Write a protein that binds this ligand. Sequence first.
Ligand SMILES: *[C@@H]1O[C@H](CO)[C@@H](O[C@@H]2O[C@H](CO)[C@@H](O[C@@H]3O[C@H](CO[C@H]4O[C@H](CO)[C@@H](O)[C@H](O[C@H]5O[C@H](CO)[C@@H](O)[C@H](O)[C@@H]5O)[C@@H]4O)[C@@H](O)[C@H](O[C@H]4O[C@H](CO)[C@@H](O)[C@H](O)[C@@H]4O)[C@@H]3O)[C@H](O)[C@H]2NC(C)=O)[C@H](O)[C@H]1NC(C)=O
Ligand SMILES: *[C@@H]1O[C@H](CO)[C@@H](O[C@@H]2O[C@H](CO)[C@@H](O[C@@H]3O[C@H](CO[C@H]4O[C@H](CO[C@H]5O[C@H](CO)[C@@H](O)[C@H](O)[C@@H]5O)[C@@H](O)[C@H](O)[C@@H]4O)[C@@H](O)[C@H](O[C@H]4O[C@H](CO)[C@@H](O)[C@H](O)[C@@H]4O)[C@@H]3O)[C@H](O)[C@H]2NC(C)=O)[C@H](O)[C@H]1NC(C)=O
Ligand SMILES: *[C@@H]1O[C@H](CO)[C@@H](O[C@@H]2O[C@H](CO)[C@@H](O[C@@H]3O[C@H](CO[C@H]4O[C@H](CO)[C@@H](O)[C@H](O)[C@@H]4O)[C@@H](O)[C@H](O[C@H]4O[C@H](CO)[C@@H](O)[C@H](O)[C@@H]4O)[C@@H]3O)[C@H](O)[C@H]2NC(C)=O)[C@H](O)[C@H]1NC(C)=O
Ligand SMILES: *[C@@H]1O[C@H](CO)[C@@H](O[C@@H]2O[C@H](CO)[C@@H](O[C@@H]3O[C@H](CO[C@H]4O[C@H](CO)[C@@H](O)[C@H](O[C@H]5O[C@H](CO)[C@@H](O)[C@H](O)[C@@H]5O)[C@@H]4O)[C@@H](O)[C@H](O)[C@@H]3O)[C@H](O)[C@H]2NC(C)=O)[C@H](O)[C@H]1NC(C)=O
Ligand SMILES: *[C@@H]1O[C@H](CO)[C@@H](O[C@@H]2O[C@H](CO)[C@@H](O[C@@H]3O[C@H](CO[C@H]4O[C@H](CO)[C@@H](O)[C@H](O[C@H]5O[C@H](CO)[C@@H](O)[C@H](O)[C@@H]5O)[C@@H]4O)[C@@H](O)[C@H](O)[C@@H]3O)[C@H](O)[C@H]2NC(C)=O)[C@H](O)[C@H]1NC(C)=O
Ligand SMILES: *[C@@H]1O[C@H](CO)[C@@H](O[C@@H]2O[C@H](CO)[C@@H](O[C@@H]3O[C@H](CO[C@H]4O[C@H](CO[C@H]5O[C@H](CO)[C@@H](O)[C@H](O)[C@@H]5O)[C@@H](O)[C@H](O)[C@@H]4O)[C@@H](O)[C@H](O)[C@@H]3O)[C@H](O)[C@H]2NC(C)=O)[C@H](O)[C@H]1NC(C)=O
Ligand SMILES: *[C@@H]1O[C@H](CO)[C@@H](O)[C@H](O[C@@H]2O[C@H](CO)[C@@H](O[C@@H]3O[C@H](CO)[C@@H](O)[C@H](O[C@H]4O[C@H](CO)[C@@H](O)[C@H](O)[C@@H]4O)[C@@H]3O)[C@H](O)[C@H]2NC(C)=O)[C@H]1NC(C)=O
Ligand SMILES: *[C@@H]1O[C@H](CO)[C@@H](O)[C@H](O)[C@H]1NC(C)=O
Lengths: 568, 49, 214, 168
Amino acid sequence: KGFGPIFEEQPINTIYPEESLEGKVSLNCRARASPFPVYKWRMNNGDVDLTNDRYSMVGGNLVINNPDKQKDAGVYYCLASNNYGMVRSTEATLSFGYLDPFPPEERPEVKVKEGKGMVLLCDPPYHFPDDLSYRWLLNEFPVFITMDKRRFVSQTNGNLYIANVESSDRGNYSCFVSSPSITKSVFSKFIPLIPIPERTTKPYPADIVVQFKDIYTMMGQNVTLECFALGNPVPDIRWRKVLEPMPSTAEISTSGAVLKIFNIQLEDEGLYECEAENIRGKDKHQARIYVQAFPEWVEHINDTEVDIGSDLYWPCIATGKPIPTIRWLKNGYSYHKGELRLYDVTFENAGMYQCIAENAYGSIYANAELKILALAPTFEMNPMKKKILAAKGGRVVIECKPKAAPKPKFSWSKGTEWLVNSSRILIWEDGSLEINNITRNDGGIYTCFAENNRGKANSTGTLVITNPTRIILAPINADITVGENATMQCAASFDPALDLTFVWSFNGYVIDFNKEITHIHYQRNFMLDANGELLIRNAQLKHAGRYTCTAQTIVDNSSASADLVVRG
Amino acid sequence: ASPFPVYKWRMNNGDVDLTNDRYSMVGGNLVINNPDKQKDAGVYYCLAS
Amino acid sequence: WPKENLDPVVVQEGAPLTLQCNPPPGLPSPVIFWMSSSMEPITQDKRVSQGHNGDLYFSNVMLQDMQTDYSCNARFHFTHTIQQKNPFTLKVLTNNPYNDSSRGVAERTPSFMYPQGTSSSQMVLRGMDLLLECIASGVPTPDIAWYKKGGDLPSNKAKFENFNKALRITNVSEEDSGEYFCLASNKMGSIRHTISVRVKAAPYWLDEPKNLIL
Amino acid sequence: KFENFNKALRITNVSEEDSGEYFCLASNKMGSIRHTISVRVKAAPYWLDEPKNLILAPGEDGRLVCRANGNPKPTVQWMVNGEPLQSAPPNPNREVAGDTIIFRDTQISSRAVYQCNTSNEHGYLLANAFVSVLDVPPRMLSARNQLIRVILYNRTRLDCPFFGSPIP
Ligand SMILES: *[C@@H]1O[C@H](CO)[C@@H](O[C@@H]2O[C@H](CO)[C@@H](O[C@@H]3O[C@H](CO[C@H]4O[C@H](CO)[C@@H](O)[C@H](O[C@H]5O[C@H](CO)[C@@H](O)[C@H](O)[C@@H]5O)[C@@H]4O)[C@@H](O)[C@H](O[C@H]4O[C@H](CO)[C@@H](O)[C@H](O)[C@@H]4O)[C@@H]3O)[C@H](O)[C@H]2NC(C)=O)[C@H](O)[C@H]1NC(C)=O
Ligand SMILES: *[C@@H]1O[C@H](CO)[C@@H](O[C@@H]2O[C@H](CO)[C@@H](O[C@@H]3O[C@H](CO[C@H]4O[C@H](CO[C@H]5O[C@H](CO)[C@@H](O)[C@H](O)[C@@H]5O)[C@@H](O)[C@H](O)[C@@H]4O)[C@@H](O)[C@H](O[C@H]4O[C@H](CO)[C@@H](O)[C@H](O)[C@@H]4O)[C@@H]3O)[C@H](O)[C@H]2NC(C)=O)[C@H](O)[C@H]1NC(C)=O
Ligand SMILES: *[C@@H]1O[C@H](CO)[C@@H](O[C@@H]2O[C@H](CO)[C@@H](O[C@@H]3O[C@H](CO[C@H]4O[C@H](CO)[C@@H](O)[C@H](O)[C@@H]4O)[C@@H](O)[C@H](O[C@H]4O[C@H](CO)[C@@H](O)[C@H](O)[C@@H]4O)[C@@H]3O)[C@H](O)[C@H]2NC(C)=O)[C@H](O)[C@H]1NC(C)=O
Ligand SMILES: *[C@@H]1O[C@H](CO)[C@@H](O[C@@H]2O[C@H](CO)[C@@H](O[C@@H]3O[C@H](CO[C@H]4O[C@H](CO)[C@@H](O)[C@H](O[C@H]5O[C@H](CO)[C@@H](O)[C@H](O)[C@@H]5O)[C@@H]4O)[C@@H](O)[C@H](O)[C@@H]3O)[C@H](O)[C@H]2NC(C)=O)[C@H](O)[C@H]1NC(C)=O
Ligand SMILES: *[C@@H]1O[C@H](CO)[C@@H](O[C@@H]2O[C@H](CO)[C@@H](O[C@@H]3O[C@H](CO[C@H]4O[C@H](CO)[C@@H](O)[C@H](O[C@H]5O[C@H](CO)[C@@H](O)[C@H](O)[C@@H]5O)[C@@H]4O)[C@@H](O)[C@H](O)[C@@H]3O)[C@H](O)[C@H]2NC(C)=O)[C@H](O)[C@H]1NC(C)=O
Ligand SMILES: *[C@@H]1O[C@H](CO)[C@@H](O[C@@H]2O[C@H](CO)[C@@H](O[C@@H]3O[C@H](CO[C@H]4O[C@H](CO[C@H]5O[C@H](CO)[C@@H](O)[C@H](O)[C@@H]5O)[C@@H](O)[C@H](O)[C@@H]4O)[C@@H](O)[C@H](O)[C@@H]3O)[C@H](O)[C@H]2NC(C)=O)[C@H](O)[C@H]1NC(C)=O
Ligand SMILES: *[C@@H]1O[C@H](CO)[C@@H](O)[C@H](O[C@@H]2O[C@H](CO)[C@@H](O[C@@H]3O[C@H](CO)[C@@H](O)[C@H](O[C@H]4O[C@H](CO)[C@@H](O)[C@H](O)[C@@H]4O)[C@@H]3O)[C@H](O)[C@H]2NC(C)=O)[C@H]1NC(C)=O
Ligand SMILES: *[C@@H]1O[C@H](CO)[C@@H](O)[C@H](O)[C@H]1NC(C)=O
């Protein structure tokens, strides 16, 4: 009653604040097995000393007290072992979050002409978490500077871009960065900005400063496009595709300088054109979008069990834009690096197999237990039913399905006869036994023998034959009008030992007689030694059709049909 | 009430000394510290004026 | 901020709420205020508002409140740094019947929330800015009015802040010392809280010594 | 034995034999898991040799033994008529060493009741012992001319109790 290690929870790539309250950091590895899983961890593809006061362990989860940049940063992986083999967790990279504040420098006061925009550097300091959200503020913190076609805030550089300057744009301006990962928000020194007023403001052409470059990104991702230009007349920005239609999943937004793509598909690949215009002139930028895809499963493997010596093929299939490479780890180490077609299974092969699909980009795991069988046959679980019934002139079939390992050979024995493939008698390979057109001499004592390389098993069967249940009087066809009372005739002959029933069917659908609706028009009155007729009251158009009487017992069943026509 | 209610309590149809360290009051609710069989048992009623 | 696991708090339509910040130790006391994670400044009015202590107070929760999350934020003057507490969320419950043939909820008395009990004591130093707060809870948005024991409020120096829930004075002398109280007037009921304002004075120059030339 | 539907295990009198490492399995169809417990069998002090009363003739040598076994080892504390040994009336015959007290050439002097408190973190044990000096001839403590009966192949006993100032 064995069972291999199976994972529930696996570790994730993780990040710890340098200046944290928490002095403890933790990684999860959770699994289940019949012999409890035993856990090992490795650091940078190298062993870790288990008890160091600093380091400690709890139920597969690893703990470090007072972790240090200098020491603990690296890639950790978790090995769940038992008696049946080893299984590697997903690679988990551990880093220390870094977010120093800005350079303390004074930022010079800024003077500009009305009608000419300008741009200010955030000066982003060192950061280990890269999920940076940028905005800009005025005088005091809570004030916020909003997106128009005039003003914009880059989400990559972190700077602020203005096309057209007005008297309202004067005052203090400060950068603002938030890291949601570590929940930290910091802001740069304020910069004074003054626009000198100018009447009959000097017009300037469209001038592209913010591009969106050739990018390789994965299937199904969120993707966002920045495109911005400058000039005295508020520049108008327009998006299109070169030589294809825009993807359905496109949203333009109010600003008209930012473009959303939900669920990038195969077809979106190619060039995208951004046209920045104004009253005076124009400019264009063309960008390359390359679609990729992480490896994603199609027929991931599952827990399989087979016999020894059987020729095996493991179907493992994933799909990626970069064609996936397949690796086969046996108990936490690579065993095969190609089509896992195996011949001549053995003792030692059995256990834990890991199918990994990695490309140039990403990797995905699939774990499976391959179990091996070599049991002697027993009838403990699926024994033979001792007693079986038969009628003359009818095909009859007997199950001999026990539980053996190497798919052994079969035999049947009638006391003083060995029975084999014949004209009317066949033993199909699954182990069951067929007989056609039975006779009185067939009834008797049969034994099923299951003959295995390693041991055999024998079960006993007793087979009795009875006088067949047949129909003496068949139903006769009838024609009537609407509202008539009709009768269908049926008589059968049978053996006293047997338990017999009568079943009436309409148009090859059995009347159940179990619900009150049917009894409205239909009635049954079985009597005598043979008599089993049916009555119909208040005939309708729908009632006309085929009526079949079936005399059914546990040995065989005999059927006979007739027709009913309705007029009016 | 529009002019907030003011509370008085009476013990055995008799007035109660308000601050006795023992006795104390909060928002119309009356409190006794270390109550004694000998002393505090009785019928109390509350007057909202 | 200490990384804490936050289940969102729930409420039936129109019950009172006290949303607690409790920052890690802060010298000086940081600038406290409330933000959405969407980075939008959060709805503040007479009905619902933030305390000087930094917690947020809902006299009565409404339907709309479910729209967005509420996150506490604290600025430290010197390092120019802001700390963001893990954001909260709320859920509302409606028992209103579906009136046939086309606020369907119960109205309720006011109650005191921040200054529990009738009485409290505060100490402010002479010349300092004096600041008092009173927080109520009634289904019809209560109105806070501030007054003083047997004396008129100095209108030149005092003013209402934070939608009538804060009173602020200028330099405080022994004149201003005494007993101040606050009314949470509401359609259904009304209640007073008293505060003992004892003004104790920091040393100040009567005759400052000047240089002697002889 | 099993108690509480196999979720509790109980043992009788415990010794250092039973000390060690015990664990428990939560076998189940889906998974199974072990918990380990370090069973350190420590002990409140218990008497290995309890000091029994010393009867001596003038000039005979006696020693008091206070040996209690405990885990951790129990600390021995010596008092004389409930007075600290430090400030007790000085005696030349008396010699204290480790856990043992020695009187060589004992005399009428220093006749008192000595107390031993063997204690540790967990518990303590207290023992008293006194020395009595008398000068009497041997005495017979049972009935004269006893009659005792017994069968052939069975164990038997004759009780002839006695006592004397020097061990007779
Ligand atoms: C990157 O891209 C991913 C998408 O791949 C973004 O993922 C987003 O995640 C959130 C969180 O799961 C999704 O939010 C959901 O929000 C709905 C709230 O809306 C419901 O109520 C609205 C008001 O009545 C109503 O307008 C909604 O219907 C609109 O929106 C849906 C999409 O939600 C849209 O498909 C419709 O056409 C409408 O326009 C909707 O009725 C909330 O109900 C969801 O919770 C349900 O499902 C969760 C399980 O997911 C379940 O646990 C709950 O009990 C409940 O049943 C869910 O929170 C959001 O939709 C995703 N964005 C999408 C799909 O575009 C991710 O945000 C992007 N990155 C960044 C950084 O933003
Ligand atoms: C004594 O007599 C018995 C009975 O006649 C003999 O047993 C017969 O042996 C033959 C030959 O081996 C078997 O035919 C094989 O069938 C295989 C397919 O088996 C599956 O399907 C069978 C039928 O199922 C039908 O319906 C399903 C569901 O709709 C369909 O999917 C299916 O296609 C059929 O239409 C099932 O009965 C069976 O359990 C399986 O599920 C074939 O794959 C097989 O061909 C292979 O092997 C050949 C050599 O054997 C080889 O030439 C081929 O290239 C290929 O490799 C073969 O055709 C019968 O199944 C089996 N039982 C019968 C007929 O009842 C027995 O051998 C004989 N003893 C002797 C001669 O010593
Ligand atoms: C005087 O003292 C002697 C010796 O001490 C006593 O003899 C004992 O008598 C008892 C019976 O009262 C004996 O118990 C016997 O046990 C036998 C089995 O002994 C073996 O297994 C036991 C454990 O079950 C071991 O402890 C032991 O070592 C042996 O290995 C039974 O077979 C006996 O029953 C049969 O024989 C007796 C004989 O007297 C018959 O009367 C019974 O009807 C029966 O047929 C018996 O039960 C015990 O073993 C003896 N020895 C000891 C050392 O105790 C006398 O009892 C005592 N009084 C007299 C002699 O009057
Ligand atoms: C904190 O508050 C306390 C309490 O109010 C202040 O302390 C004392 O307050 C009393 C008022 O209760 C003052 O008494 C006043 O004294 C005035 C003296 O006149 C000079 O000072 C006036 C301002 O106090 C000033 O306006 C005046 O000039 C005016 O008239 C001129 C023409 O004549 C004109 O040109 C000027 O521009 C101006 O309009 C004089 O300079 C008197 O005039 C008042 O009527 C009143 O009697 C005390 O003086 C206050 N104590 C002191 C030491 O001055 C305390 O000052 C407050 N502290 C702060 C920092 O505000
Ligand atoms: C827990 O408490 C018990 C009870 O007090 C302690 O048992 C004492 O153990 C000591 C040390 O072994 C014994 O001294 C031995 O005595 C032997 C004689 O034992 C026979 O007679 C017993 C009745 O008096 C009888 O129970 C015993 O049979 C049992 O033990 C046999 C051991 O061989 C076993 O074969 C039998 O099947 C049965 O289980 C004997 O017939 C003697 O042979 C030894 O040489 C030695 O002198 C004490 O006698 C025991 N106590 C009693 C009352 O007999 C035990 O040590 C305690 N354990 C802890 C950890 O504290
Ligand atoms: C399949 O075919 C094999 C080989 O013929 C059968 O093996 C023996 O079959 C006979 C049939 O009569 C069995 O006798 C039966 O015993 C039943 C109860 O079993 C009792 O004996 C068993 C062992 O006996 C064997 O070993 C002794 C050793 O001294 C030999 O002397 C015997 O000859 C036997 O070989 C015990 O294990 C069991 O606990 C019982 O005490 C009884 O109910 C039946 O009425 C009948 O008398 C014989 O037991 C079989 N022996 C073995 C080893 O299998 C086999 O039974 C057949 N199986 C079936 C299902 O038919
Ligand atoms: C944007 O950044 C700018 C960068 O400096 C900044 O100037 C601007 O606002 C603040 O503006 C105030 C005044 O409005 C400045 O304060 C002044 O400081 C002077 C010395 O540096 C001082 O002499 C002056 O004094 C005035 O008042 C006294 C009476 O009290 C009178 O006697 C004098 O004659 C003057 O009239 C005044 O105090 C700040 O220095 C300045 N910078 C800050 C606060 O950082 C920023 N805000 C906006 C909206 O543009
Ligand atoms: C393995 O899983 C696939 C996908 O669910 C399923 O089609 C297949 O039948 C499974 N095979 C086994 C042996 O469970």
